[PDB]
Paper text:
In this work we capture intermediate states of bEBPs in facilitating DNA opening and partial unfolding of σ54, and therefore link the ATPase activity to DNA opening and σ54 remodeling, which eventually lead to transcription activation.
Interestingly, DNA with a partially opened bubble between −11 and −8 did not support transcription, suggesting that this complex is unable to proceed further to an open complex. In the RPi(−11/−8), we observe multiple structural conformations, at varying degrees of tilt of PspF1-275 hexamer ring relative to RNAP-σ54 and varying degrees of RNAP clamp opening We also observe significant degrees of promoter DNA bending, demonstrating the wide degree of conformational flexibility in the complex. The DNA density downstream of −10 was generally poorly resolved, indicating that this region was highly flexible. In these complexes, we observe a previously unreported interaction between [name] and σ54 RpoN domain. Significantly, we observe the σ54 N terminus is further shifted along the [name] hexamer in RPi(−11/−8) and RPi(−10/−1) compared to that of RPi(−12/−11).
Residue numbers in the entry:
A (entry chain D): 52 to 101
B (entry chain 5), G (entry chain 3): 5 to 259
C (entry chain M): 1 to 8, 11 to 46, 107 to 475
D (entry chain C): 846 to 1043
E (entry chain D): 253 to 302
F (entry chain 4): 1 to 259
The structure:
DNA sequence: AGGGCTGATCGTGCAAAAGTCGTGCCAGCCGTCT
DNA sequence: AGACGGCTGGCACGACTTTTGCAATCGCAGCCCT
């Protein structure tokens, strides 16, 4: 959901390192922030930790 | 269910026939004296018809324009002519299931007779340049002062027009023909008219003039009696005036 | 009067925009209404549950972490695994992951080594990456003692193109081997870890919100508008009662303008819903044959005449007809999907290009797998139906269906 | 698409199908060791596009298409042993009867053997009545024993009392045959009334 | 906590604080419109509660 | 294939042979001309022919010369493509253009417009049709069928019917018998009509046709073959009757006013 | 050029005169018997005229409507009226050099006569409110069953209407008149009727009935003979039927 | 004492140019049998 | 072993869909300019 509950660019990372939109879809990508949605493409522990 | 019918033997038989034929959606014919209001019985039957909850729209045959007869029996599809929009159902298509009492049916011309013969069939309504005709079933009703057999013998009406009729041609007896409860019905009509015109009643009343006019022609079998009664009431302009010197002769010049 | 007749307004801006929003979709209109209501002042158990690779993604990473790997090796394996499509193959190769990282330390060689170590971990052939080497990896992991293993390996190595057409005889001629000599090898190659998890790898769930649901209540399918998916426009009556008493003319005028705009928008939305319902009833009446029989019984159903005969015209209804869906026994059908092609006539013809495609699929199915049937046969069937397809006017239909026939693809028996 | 038991489990071991009967279910009395699969229902799965990679997969292996999720019944863990029998109930509108027709056939066989036995006794009583009515009047039991022949078809042991008794008993036997046929028909309808699931 | 899978059946996780946040955004739009002080106070009664 | 007529309102004496001859001519698509009593035995014959009509999916488009007004008749006859004649819009499919390959079912309306007849003479001349304001004529094909009620030669001698109209038409003659002449299936048709009336009106039983009713029907001139009998039967059923009298004092003739 | 012309002395002379005036594009009148196929011979001569490869469009003189006389004889400029777009040349303008074969001219009205007199002028195609008339030259031909001199004596034909045709009137002989290829035309018609009726041939053949019908008026000089031959062939119902018991009498109630 | 002019309020269609399919139809080719 | 052939896909054009881009003129009258 766009800006909904557990929304992208919010509440931590995504399920996979792939972004919800799809931009910067790689676990290797660390500092690359998808322009479509600014969310962490990393391990999902931050999802609880955000 | 409001006509001031005498409910006499002839009136009761006619009402029974109308009620029996009310459920039937087949076309019916009305004979008798026009101007008397056989159309009121037709409206009563249409209300009592099976299509009681149906849009019933009667039509005067003489009302339709000759060059607009097509637009009268149908609707311009607007795919033609200078007229736009249109696409409006004809009066029959406007009713489309109710009662269309044919008024001035005897006034229908040979072209009108042929158009009616075309309408003797069921539905199949094609508009101006229509892709396909539309079938719509509606109950039919016709009234005519003149004798349909007489017109057919004269050839004024088309043969199929007579063949268009299916139910019994209900013939209306004249004023002198029944003359059983006409006194009571006329008295009731006069009372209602007096109440409507804020006239209480006629203290003079009496029926010697009424008994004499019972032996009167009354060409307007029902309407003429009421009109003459209203004329007498207005001209007398008094209640305590018995049925004396009162005759059905409004056009007559006094001496 | 005579055979003659006669001919008999103008608006813009606000009503134009109101009508334009009606031309949009269901979820798009919901989003637009949500955004509009955000400015309108007078309108009215941490992490759920799952499993290792529940959506086909974490079993591979767990297996990799269950094995000794360095931080860079683990990162390369994670780049391979997380960038694995719903088919189980690595959706993004090593180059894509390296580019997204932009790190020279995680090079192509390191990523390739990590993938090879995790080539067959749990299950075999993970992050397969356009799986052609993954099939070979599955075959090699399979015991080489299996019969015709050399033949299967030779077929999988570079004879893939020959077997793509399924021309077993031509493939054997190319390989200079007897036909069906590697039939056991061919069968084993068919049974060779397709997409590893394949269906398990295919965690592709199902999502659908048809704008309508065709219950087909006692035939003459009852089209019921998705009222739950249909928002209800609520105007904040509290702002209405708090604006009338406002002695400030500016606030009262603003509230009145907001009320008028909300009324116009609600009218536009209600008109869109009503027109969609009427057009859906008409389409259901026209294509109950398509709803019950299927795509073969497809006739054109774009709203016309009836919509004009009812009110206004099909104009702006063609505009609002966009993006309307229905869930039916046949399945999910769109508004434009309801309208079909015309064969018996220029418009509204009995057959349709969709019917053409359905008949073509049936005919191609009604043939030996070695060679599909001639389109001339389906053409004769259409001619019996009145379309008069002929073999050439069928080429377009076959291309739309994309069924590979013998001349397109020749399979050996 | 409903999960239909046809043993057509996509990517199923041959031994797994080797136990299931063609009805998806297995044969009866069969013993299961470990987590054996008995009834393989084919729950439909979602579809996809052309997917030229999956197009090539179908051209190679095929027959799976990721369209039928496996709803197969496999034996529970720590559960293995003899299957004494089974029961299958199909809702009204579904009557595959792959082995349900066989089960209903066995049941109706027992039911008719029941109905026949009473009907057999009734018919035997009528036949013996006819034989006695014709007996002691030149219609020897050997004539009746060789062929029922309606006890030589009113041979004339009395030819008036024998004849009238024969006519009455013939009417009674016709009525009884009609009644037995109707009872068998009602029983067959009840056995064929099937199940009605949710 | 989706028991049937078809419905999430949010085990006390569906935050009306999301609906409260929507109401707060409406309050912010109205403040941009400078809504009446009564509306502002009542807006707090709901948004400030979150 | 074989399509049964919806009704077989024919005469046992020779309308059976007439139907046989019609079936003999049924395969042909040439001008088929029927004749008989107008309103009675005419369009019933048309429906029987349409049942016996060759092939299928043929638009049996029926037109009556009474309709289409006067000025608007030509536009609907020849069609209309150019503007100002059909209000522009689409190329108006004319009444003739409506049925392409279908039967041109004619009604014995006897259009007094000799211009209408002259237009129809070109209608079947080489199988062509040009729309109003149409820049190009279009060759069209359709079947032809008609029913008649008056002596076309008598009108032609009287000039009421154009000699060219009968010259282009009148390839073969099929006259339906008058009602006063057949007198054969009269009992059969009467029984069929009585049964149909009892069925439709939910009458418990057909009251039955008394010998006096049959004698009156035989004596009745019945100018209409298939409808006048139908209308008389309808009027008699409307008059109704108890189960006691089968047809005593049955009012077949509704034109007769009551006492 | 598909008509099975009798090639009789009359028919051959007619064909020869048609060819002789085929190169000339002047107005002419094809007189004689209509119904007999003047249209087919007109098409043959148009294929045989000087401009054989030309767009030839014929029509019935009284086909159109009275109020649409301008819209038929010309094209709607669409500058006025509810008409839109239009600007479509008339059928005569559609030919634009072709043969405007006049058919059914006997039914033309007085307004039609005025329009034809306007057509007697060299081209001059002026639309409603058009800029300037356009002079367009096309071949002209006329055919009618009535005597235009008789109409002009009755005054029905205008003087220009009589003068509309620019050549001597060529008459078509009747069936009772030509009576020359009657056997040959009869045999051709019998062959055609047998082929159409899926009959290979008539084993009875013969012309005794044909000879008897030769001593008949046959007013529909070609139409009546063909219709009667087809009717007799159909009525016989057997190929082995000689030219006996066969006659032309569709109307008569058979004994 | 007489002119100017002031902006309120003024709503369910359609059409006009474009697109765009439906059907058909050409061109080549490869499977092949010659 | 090159041509039949059906495929197929490009190529083509009318017929059906569409969508977007279009609302002044008040008529109050009072105030302000003349």
């Amino acid at each position: 959901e766009r800006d909904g509950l557990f929304c992208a660019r919010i509440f931590g990372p995504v399920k996979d390192y792939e972004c919800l939109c799809g931009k910067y879809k790689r676990l290797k990508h660390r500092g690359v922030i998808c322009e479509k949605c600014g969310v962490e493409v990393t391990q999902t522990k931050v999802r609880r930790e955000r | 269910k409001d006509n001031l019918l005498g409910e006499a033997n002839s009136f009761l038989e006619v009402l029974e026939q109308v009620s029996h034929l009310a459920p039937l959606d087949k076309p019916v014919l009305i004979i008798g004296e026009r101007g008397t209001g056989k159309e009121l019985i037709a409206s009563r039957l249409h209300y009592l018809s099976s299509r009681w909850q149906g849009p019933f729209i009667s039509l005067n045959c003489a009302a339709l324009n000759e060059n607009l007869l097509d637009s009268e029996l149908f609707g311009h599809e607007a795919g033609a002519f200078t007229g736009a929009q249109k696409r409006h159902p004809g009066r029959f298509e406007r009713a489309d299931g109710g009662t269309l009492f044919l008024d001035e049916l005897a006034t229908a011309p040979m072209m009108v007779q042929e158009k009616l013969l075309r309408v003797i069939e069921y539905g199949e309504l094609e508009r101006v340049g229509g892709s396909q005709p539309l079938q719509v079933n509606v109950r039919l009703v016709c009234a005519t002062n003149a004798d349909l057999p007489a017109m057919v013998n004269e050839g004024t009406f088309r043969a199929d027009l007579l063949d268009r009729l299916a139910f019994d041609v209900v013939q209306l007896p004249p004023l002198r023909e029944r003359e059983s409860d006409i006194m009571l019905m006329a008295e009731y009509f006069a009372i209602q008219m007096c109440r409507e015109i804020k006239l209480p009643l006629f203290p003079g009343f009496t029926e010697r003039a009424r008994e004499t006019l019972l032996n009167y022609r009354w060409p307007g079998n029902i309407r003429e009696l009421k009109n003459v009664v209203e004329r007498s009431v207005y001209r007398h302009g008094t209640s305590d005036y018995p049925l004396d010197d009162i005759i059905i002769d409004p056009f007559k010049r006094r001496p | 009067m005579k055979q003659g007749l006669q001919l008999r307004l103008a608006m813009t801006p606000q009503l134009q925009q109101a009508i334009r929003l009606l031309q949009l979709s269901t979820l798009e209109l919901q989003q637009e209404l949500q955004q509009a209501l955000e400015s309108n002042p007078l309108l009215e158990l941490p992490v759920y549950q799952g499993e290792t690779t529940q959506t086909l993604q974490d079993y591979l990473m767990w297996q990799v972490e269950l094995t000794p790997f360095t931080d860079t090796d683990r990162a390369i394996a994670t780049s391979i695994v997380d960038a694995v499509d719903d088919t189980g193959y690595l959706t993004i190769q090593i180059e894509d992951i390296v580019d997204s990282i932009g790190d020279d330390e995680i090079g192509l060689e390191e990523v390739e080594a990590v993938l090879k170590r995790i080539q067959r971990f749990d299950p075999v052939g993970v992050a397969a990456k356009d799986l052609r080497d993954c099939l070979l990896i599955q075959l090699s992991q399979f015991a080489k003692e299996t019969p015709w293993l050399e033949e299967a390996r030779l077929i999988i190595s570079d004879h893939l193109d020959l077997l793509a057409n399924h021309d077993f005889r031509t493939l054997m001629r190319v390989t200079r081997l007897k036909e069906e000599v590697l039939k056991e090898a061919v069968n084993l190659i068919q049974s060779l870890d397709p997409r590893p998890g394949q269906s398990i790898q295919t965690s592709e769930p199902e999502y659908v919100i048809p704008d309508v649901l065709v219950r087909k209540v006692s035939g003459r399918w009852t089209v019921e508008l998705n009222a739950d998916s249909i928002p209800r426009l609520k105007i904040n009556q509290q702002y209405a009662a708090m604006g009338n008493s406002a002695r400030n003319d500016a606030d009262g005028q603003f509230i009145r303008s907001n009320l008028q705009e909300a009324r116009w928008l609600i009218k536009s939305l209600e008109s869109r819903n009503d027109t969609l319902l009427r057009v859906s009833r008409c389409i259901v009446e026209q294509q109950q044959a398509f709803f019950e029989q299927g795509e073969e019984y497809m006739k054109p159903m774009v709203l016309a005449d009836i919509a004009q005969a009812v009110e206004m015209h099909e104009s702006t209804i063609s505009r609002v007809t966009t993006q309307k869906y229905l869930h039916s026994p046949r399945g999910i059908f769109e508004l434009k999907y309801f309208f079909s092609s015309h064969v018996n006539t220029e418009g509204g013809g009995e057959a349709s290009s969709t019917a053409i495609r359905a008949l073509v699929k049936k005919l191609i199915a009604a043939e030996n797998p070695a060679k599909p049937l001639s389109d001339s046969k389906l053409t004769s069937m259409l001619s019996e139906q009145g379309i008069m397809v002929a073999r050439r006017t069928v080429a377009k239909y076959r291309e739309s269906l994309s069924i590979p026939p013998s001349n397109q693809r020749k399979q050996l028996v | 698409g409903p999960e239909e038991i046809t043993a057509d489990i996509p990517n199923v071991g041959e031994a797994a199908l080797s136990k299931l009967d063609e009805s998806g279910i297995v044969y009866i009395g069969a013993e299961v060791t470990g987590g054996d699969i008995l009834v393989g229902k084919v729950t439909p799965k979602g579809e996809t596009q052309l997917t030229p990679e999956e197009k090539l997969l179908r051209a190679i292996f095929g027959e799976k298409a990721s369209d039928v999720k496996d709803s197969s019944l496999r034996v529970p863990n720590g559960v293995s042993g003899t299957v004494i029998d089974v029961q299958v109930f199909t809702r009204d509108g579904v009557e595959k009867d792959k082995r349900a027709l066989e089960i209903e056939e066995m049941q109706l066989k027992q039911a008719k053997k029941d109905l026949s036995e009473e009907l057999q006794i009734l018919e035997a009583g009528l036949f013996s009545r006819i034989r006695a009515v014709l007996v002691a009047g030149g219609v020897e039991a050997e004539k009746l024993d060789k062929l029922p022949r309606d006890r030589w078809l009113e041979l004339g042991l009395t030819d008036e009392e024998k004849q009238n008794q024969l006519e009455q008993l013939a009417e009674q036997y016709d009525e009884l045959k009609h009644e037995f046929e109707k009872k068998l028909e009602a029983k067959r309808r009840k056995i064929t009334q099937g199940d009605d699931l949710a | 906590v989706p028991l049937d899978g078809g419905r999430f059946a949010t085990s006390d996780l569906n935050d009306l604080y999301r609906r409260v946040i929507n109401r707060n955004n409406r309050l912010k739009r109205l403040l941009d419109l400078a809504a009446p002080d009564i509306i502002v106070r009542n807006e707090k009664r709901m948004l400030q509660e979150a």
